[PDB]
Amino acid sequence: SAIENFDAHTPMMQQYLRLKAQHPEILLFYRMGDFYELFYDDAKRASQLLDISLTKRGASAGEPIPMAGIPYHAVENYLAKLVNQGESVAICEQIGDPATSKGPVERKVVRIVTPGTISDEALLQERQDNLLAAIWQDSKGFGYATLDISSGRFRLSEPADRETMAAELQRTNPAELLYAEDFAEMSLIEGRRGLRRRPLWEFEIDTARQQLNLQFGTRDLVGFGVENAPRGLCAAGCLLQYAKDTQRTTLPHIRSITMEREQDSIIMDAATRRNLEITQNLAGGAENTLASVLDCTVTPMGSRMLKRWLHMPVRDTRVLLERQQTIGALQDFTAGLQPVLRQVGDLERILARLALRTARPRDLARMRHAFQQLPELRAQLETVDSAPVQALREKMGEFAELRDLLERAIIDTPPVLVRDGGVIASGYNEELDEWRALADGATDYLERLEVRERERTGLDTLKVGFNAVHGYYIQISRGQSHLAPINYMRRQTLKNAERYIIPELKEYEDKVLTSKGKALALEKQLYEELFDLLLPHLEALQQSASALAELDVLVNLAERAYTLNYTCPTFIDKPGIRITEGRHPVVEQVLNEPFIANPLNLSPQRRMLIITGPNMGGKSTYMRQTALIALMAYIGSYVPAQKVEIGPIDRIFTRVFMVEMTETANILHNATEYSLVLMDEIGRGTSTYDGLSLAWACAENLANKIKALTLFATHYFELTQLPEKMEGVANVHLDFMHSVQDGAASKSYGLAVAALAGVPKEVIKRARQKLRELESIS
Amino acid sequence: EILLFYRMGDFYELFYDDAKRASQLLDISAVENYLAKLVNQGESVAICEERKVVRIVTPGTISDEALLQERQDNLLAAIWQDSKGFGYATLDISSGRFRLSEPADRETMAAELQRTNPAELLYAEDFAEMSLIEGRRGLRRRPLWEFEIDTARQQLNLQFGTRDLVGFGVENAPRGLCAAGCLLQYAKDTQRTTLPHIRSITMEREQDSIIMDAATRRNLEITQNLAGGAENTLASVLDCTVTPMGSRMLKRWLHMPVRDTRVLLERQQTIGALQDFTAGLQPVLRQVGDLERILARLALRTARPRDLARMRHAFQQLPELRAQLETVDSAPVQALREKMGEFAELRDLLERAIIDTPPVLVRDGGVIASGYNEELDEWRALADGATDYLERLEVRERERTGLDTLKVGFNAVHGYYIQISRGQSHLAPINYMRRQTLKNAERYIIPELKEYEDKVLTSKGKALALEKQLYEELFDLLLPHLEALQQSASALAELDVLVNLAERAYTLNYTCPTFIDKPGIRITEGRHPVVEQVLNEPFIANPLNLSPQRRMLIITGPNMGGKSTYMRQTALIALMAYIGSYVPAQKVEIGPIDRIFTRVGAADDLASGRSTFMVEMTETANILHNATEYSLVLMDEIGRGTSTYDGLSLAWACAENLANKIKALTLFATHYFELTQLPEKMEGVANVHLDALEHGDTIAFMHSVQDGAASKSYGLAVAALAGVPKEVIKRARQKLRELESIS
DNA sequence: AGCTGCCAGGCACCAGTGT
DNA sequence: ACTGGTGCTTGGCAGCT
């Protein structure tokens, strides 16, 4: 094995290796003219991942270099491939002109494509958030931060325990997760997509505070309410540095940061989120979820917002009551607003590409199309009687000048890129129109030159054409080649044809090519000028898009409440849930059968229901719908019931061997009289009574000590004695029965199921006999 | 409805629902890569290349290496329902193994599907039991006329070259024949070639094998773990076969334990005999490869040069294998040695006919070796003659002109040419006729160059045509021996399976089980063949003593998988004994076993709204209805999932029935102490248990089976470890005493 | 409409004219 | 040091059919 030496490498590889040294662990697209190339292991790994060929490059001194590459113009196709596989990619471009450059051309990494920092439409998921996130652990606790780089929505939290930290990850579901080398709880993180093991120095608190205050243009972060969250700031700092390092542009759209403090929302553990299937069914998909029923939003940003709302039920009554008002007010105007709102589209993500200076002509056209809907929406919303709605109407904005600007500046349906020109509309720039008229002037001249020359020569096959390689030409067929005029200079030969050039033709070639080149250059300059004109209003536009997205969510939840017959829940002082004709919002929609509605009456005096009765999904649905009604009430939506009075709820536990006892312990430790606890048939014991013993003791603890609002489904008939012994406990039972009755389950229903299951009549009779023997002694 | 790949230039496009369904299945927003994806998911695909469909690949009828799964069977199957019962048929189109059955009830029909697991399932429009088939891959709703009996008998007798099917032992089975007919027509319709490799058909009779229901197959994880994959299965441990066909055979064996003692004893003999020669045979056997599937592509006339090269390579191993196996003392082994064959002429034929490492296709030629055909060699020499002339023409013309950039090249469009660079274009000779101009170069032609172009192109064309003819000639020469070759591949595959099971027995320390007259199982130092391998901890071996006098064991104690493993390993030992393999134990005496029932593991609902507890009681009912004194019954903690007394009452009544009425060999795991009274009341019942050691800060669930009932309850101990408040545990400990002391 | 194969623009390389 | 050929990934499409 030979000894490598940087001085022995060719200037190109010297340049490459110096750049690659800055990105050892990730793939580097070193630009070489029209191709983005890769070398050594990068080439080997790329050829496997991207399904491209692996070749070599010569070196007279040394061994040949593994090579692989792709044309620059098809880069987005391959970035998509790598990003879906969780691979980061460094984009190294050519800076400086090879004509002027003596050695290899100067080459900087201009950006780094990574799963959590993508802002391109083609790589992103329309109705799904894509979050970069950072996670930090301390001797005192955890520190978390997330960033939607396409909206600049930057948040921060400081979970106390891993149970809350696991819930954060479940809820937020980051696409790329930064973490410290010294992270203790790898179990939380291991086997996650987009893992990024960062060095411990990036989570420095003094740099984080410095770097965040720099970004936000503040001297202290007291205003953002994150000043006393150092664990969070350490994560936020690490994240912001990464975000910057990958984009390598200024990130103006990241204006603020927010503490998400647990007391402000209804806490839900990871299991409880999955059991309630809020945005994700138990099988993994999105069908038959609460979101699948509620989300009929017309814009992607609205869809994404509503999903965030569902996972973060707010506890702030002022916010809740304002949503209810807005929902009631907008019910008559849903048909009117929604068609117009639809035309605004995903303005949120368009503005990110504006902020990053990556917005393509279609983005600005869609942005222009969105501005055109604004006067219409303002007209509709003026008559709506709500302070919340009028606030949104105000925040929504009008942007008349910008609407006008883009109407003038860009054509009706522009191309996908500016690269080839044709984006800018005529009349916007006088210099540009002149250059285009010169190009079309030479176009005309050349057309009349064709008919002139074929007349003048008398050769019917005589044509005028253009070749990218050889320029303009006069083509004559093989048969008539000999009759070409003296002044025709042959420029190209084909099998059945000959092509010539004359000074007149060459003169207007130079005319049209310089004209087009001049125009193309001017479009690109005029296009970058639009960014300088629009970006001064970015904060106002970001607010508009936020108003428009929230307006979509509320108009949607207004429409859903009507179309699905929901009612407005009332809030009460004391803990309790009082549902009349309650329904499961998803099950009633997926089943074509009519849903059997049911009541619920939980109060401080009636805390725990022991739900005996047969095995089936009726119990689970009764319990789950109770949670989903509470959840929906606390996102400010209407709820699937005839009437609902609901008191404060601090968190929802939805429990449905040791894994059972751990989850039960989690409930007993963290539950409080403001908690909604849903438990299904715990009591897995080594023997006959040890499961019952714990089932008893937990129920006992949940009723006397914790006093949580508990639905406690069980098969133990022994637990139907709890109301006799304890204050606050009561019996209900489901009697396809599907209707909740007061009192305990009437039959002993195990043998009945065994009969249905097909156990021999003889065997059931001997059980029925044995059952009497057991009951008569006890 | 089939997916359609409408070709649009360089892309195969799809539209409407096809596009929607494709984007989901294929993970799209290189065709053979995606066909493989769809075929494994049981999807048919139409290939549209005028503008019309040239090919349709169907998941159950594929025979191409690139689409198939090397070590996995791929079965087309047909299912028929009748007022009298069910009718089933399956076909491995790559081996021509065609079978037929007539399940009496849906329980047996479900087991067939589970076991066979077809890649593409044909069914009649009037199928009553959708539940059996709904949500399965490769569903194909066929019209009811394809299941006609008179056409089936006609079409089958045509295929097999018989007038009557009495010889195949399927003459009686009309339901099966209806399915078999529907299937054969489909098979033919999509290959649309003669299918010579389909030479027979076979009825399988339940009494000849150990019956296993679907649940029991999945709970024993014979070839498929509970999660769906193939890791941590009995097959994952036993299958260290060197050929794919051997792998696939062994998997079939595991799912079909034979009851025929003669067959079993013959396998045991073969296994014992071959133990010293495993190191020797396996490296050679490996080089035979998947001859089974190569012969299908021969039979279908789709075999590519590499197939025949691999077939030639396989024939070369045969004399070596025959030499090794001659000294082996077994009638069974010598029978395989005979059936294996030698095919000396065919080996020689392919050595002469095809080059060492041929191309992937014949399309471009270069497959046939020189010396095989005199006409071909002449045509090649003429081509190479003009090749030489043109090569010397290059150096001649560049010398004569003095132009160093002067080259001679070839273009499909323009033919041969003399290329000169832009810089030296003006110095081209007068006789050079320019016919193509490039950016930095010019290309010309002369009559001498055009003359030898016609010479080489006609020569090559003549040769290419002759190769393709000589290649198709090889099929005409090989195919007459297809039946003999199919038997060889069958012998080679079975030899691989037995050599493997010989090697596994040694490497994994298995022993030969003995068979006894009366029902029983007597294991010494028994082990779970998978768990002992997956766990890096030492496996605690355990005995078992089940007889007619000791039929049922009530297994109380803590179940933290220790009970399930003790029970599952008992089944897997019985299963392995009855595929003729050695078994994971110090010693095993085993009596006749008619059926294995395994009510173990927690049963996921499939048709929901019926609980977990009913799934247990359904499987329980299946046991009580169908079990017999020759049955091995494994039950895990039934009574669980419903009221304390209700559950105990059934648990009692089932055990009672299984000990007195059925008298099956039963392992009955339970948490009810009350059931530990059964040995006092009933003759053939006894108590065993597992326990846990407690010392200091250490608590360990032991895996050792002890005689007598369980002493203690470890539920509260686990709850303590899990972190349930000390106060809550104390109140449970209090409540537990109250419950136990009353009863 | 269906193929070949030329070309895109980096850069290093090799071979024929430069002391 | 110079000059004018060579090679190299994949995709676009001219130039043939």
Swiss-Prot record, chain B:
Domain of life the protein comes from: Bacteria
Cysteine disulfide links: none
The keyword Transcription regulation is assigned to this record: no
Statement: the UniProt record of this protein carries the keyword Heme: no
Swiss-Prot/TrEMBL keywords: ATP-binding, DNA damage, DNA repair, DNA-binding, Nucleotide-binding
SMART domains: MUTSac, MUTSd
Example GO BP: regulation of DNA recombination
A GO CC term assigned to this protein in UniProt: mismatch repair complex
Pfam families: MutS_I (PF01624), MutS_II (PF05188), MutS_III (PF05192), MutS_IV (PF05190), MutS_V (PF00488)
MF-aspect GO terms: adenine/cytosine mispair binding; ADP binding; ATP binding; ATP hydrolysis activity; ATP-dependent DNA damage sensor activity; damaged DNA binding; DNA binding, bending; identical protein binding
Binding site for ATP: G557, P558, N559, M560, G561, G562, K563, S564
NCBIfam families for this protein: mutS1, PRK05399.1
Function: This protein is involved in the repair of mismatches in DNA. It is possible that it carries out the mismatch recognition step. This protein has a weak ATPase activity.
Family: Belongs to the DNA mismatch repair MutS family.
Record's protein name: DNA mismatch repair protein MutS
Organism: Escherichia coli (strain K12)
Gene: mutS
